Design a protein around this ligand. Structure first.
Ligand SMILES: Nc1ccn([C@H]2C[C@H](O)[C@@H](COP(=O)(O)OP(=O)(O)OP(=O)(O)O)O2)c(=O)n1
Ligand SMILES: *[C@@H]1O[C@@H]2Oc3cc(OC)c4c5c(c(=O)oc4c3[C@@H]2[C@H]1O)C(=O)CC5
Ligand SMILES: [Ca+2]
Length: 343
DNA sequence: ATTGAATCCTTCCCCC
DNA sequence: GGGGGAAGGATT
């Protein structure tokens, strides 16, 4: 009668991988950070286990104000590389419960189990063989979501977490389509959470009050045609294998600068590790982005008829860096690169 | 107040 | 306006 989307989402993943390697931390509040040798203890949180969130230590906030909230808690520099090996291992596992996998991010996969589950009953059934396998061969807990489409399966997971599992039968959908808050619909942030709020929309069903031709100039086609597409219990987007369309790095400079010969070594580092992550792909395009003193991003790109040798990237960055320097007047505080249009 | 990394949607311009 | 290229925008 339709499709069943199974969504797996790792719990406080980054932090949880720190525990799985060093239980000399479980129970205690773990905070995964990122800095730069800037001032010291400067940067932003990446994620924190649940025993640290209760106190106001979520991702995003500067590790600085976090200390004044939990000077007791354990702070760990982030090892993105480590979490990535764990993740590629869990992912490969899921890969054998359905060849119809996606992988929204490093800790999210969407499985299309419509082919191996006659009904939600057996879905939940797989919902658990899975949670257990993952927890067995990785000692990691994951929350699972199940429903008719990728969007709701996610919303599910984000309710059953942590460590949970949940289901949303056509009935609960309609109940959520009229009851779930709006700032909770996957794909909406505070910015769009304002236009919708005051305009006849406080909840997903509200986007049914007003016609798109009035919001299709407030949140723009794709978005509106997407919200409404849901409330109007019509949404049914497929589970396609996501592809990496851009890799790159950006670093943070000790001091803010505008002296091109000072910046260049930074930009080059960014290109080298950036070219490492790039593995064995060949970008035809390339952009240089810089974070000025007042976090206002400025980027400049170039696209070629052919791939970009590393030797040519190094050389093509400066021009893009200079282009920036001339036009924009402010200083530079964060400089990096980003390759695109892969062959 | 710093530090990721990526998507995809949008919006202003050349050009058959 | 359409291909596509380009720089800023708004989530995750
Ligand atoms: N500004 C943001 C917001 C989100 N994300 C990513 C981080 C997560 O890993 C992924 C989203 O997954 P979830 O919100 O479902 O949370 P998870 O439980 O998988 O992640 P977390 O490690 O926070 O528990 O999107 C990101 O990179 N940058
Ligand atoms: C961007 O600046 C901060 O740095 C990071 C780094 C993260 O992961 C490596 C990160 C994550 C999440 C998040 O919400 O924020 C960050 C941030 C901060 C951002 O504001 C997640 O949910 C997972 C990783
Ligand atoms: Ca979580």
């Amino acid at each position: 009668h339709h499709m069943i989307v199974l969504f797996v989402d790792f719990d406080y993943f980054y932090a949880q991988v720190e525990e799985v390697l060093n239980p000399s931390l479980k129970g205690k509040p773990v905070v995964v950070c990122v800095f730069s040798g800037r001032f010291e203890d400067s940067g932003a949180v990446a994620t924190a286990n649940y025993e640290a969130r209760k106190f106001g230590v979520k991702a995003g906030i500067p590790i600085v104000e976090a200390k004044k909230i939990l000077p007791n808690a354990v702070y760990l520099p982030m090892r993105k590389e480590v979490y990535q090996q764990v993740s590629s291992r869990i992912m490969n596992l899921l890969r054998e419960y359905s060849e119809k996998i996606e992988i929204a991010s490093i800790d999210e996969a969407y499985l299309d189990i419509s082919d191996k589950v006659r009904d939600y009953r057996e879905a939940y059934n797989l919902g658990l063989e899975i949670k257990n396998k993952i927890l067995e061969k990785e000692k990691i807990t994951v929350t699972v979501g199940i429903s008719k489409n990728k969007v709701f399966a996610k919303i599910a997971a984000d309710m059953a977490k942590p460590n949970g599992i949940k289901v949303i039968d056509d009935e609960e959908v309609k109940r959520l389509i009229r009851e779930l808050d709006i700032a909770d619909v996957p794909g909406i942030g505070n910015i769009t959470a304002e236009k919708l709020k005051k305009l006849g929309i406080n909840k997903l069903v509200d986007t049914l009050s007003i016609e798109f031709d009035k919001l299709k100039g407030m949140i723009g086609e794709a978005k509106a045609k997407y919200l409404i597409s849901l409330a109007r219990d019509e949404y049914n987007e497929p589970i396609r294998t996501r592809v990496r369309k851009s890799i790159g790095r950006i670093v943070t400079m000790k001091r803010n600068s505008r002296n091109l010969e000072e910046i260049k070594p930074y930009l080059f580092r960014a290109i080298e590790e950036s070219y490492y992550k790039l593995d064995k792909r060949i970008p035809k395009a390339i952009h240089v982005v810089a974070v000025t003193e007042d976090l206002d991003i400025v980027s400049r790109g170039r696209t070629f008829p052919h791939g970009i040798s590393k030797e040519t990237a190094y050389s093509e960055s400066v021009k893009l860096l200079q282009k920036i320097l001339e036009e924009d007047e402010r200083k530079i505080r964060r400089i990096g690169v980003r390759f695109s249009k892969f062959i």
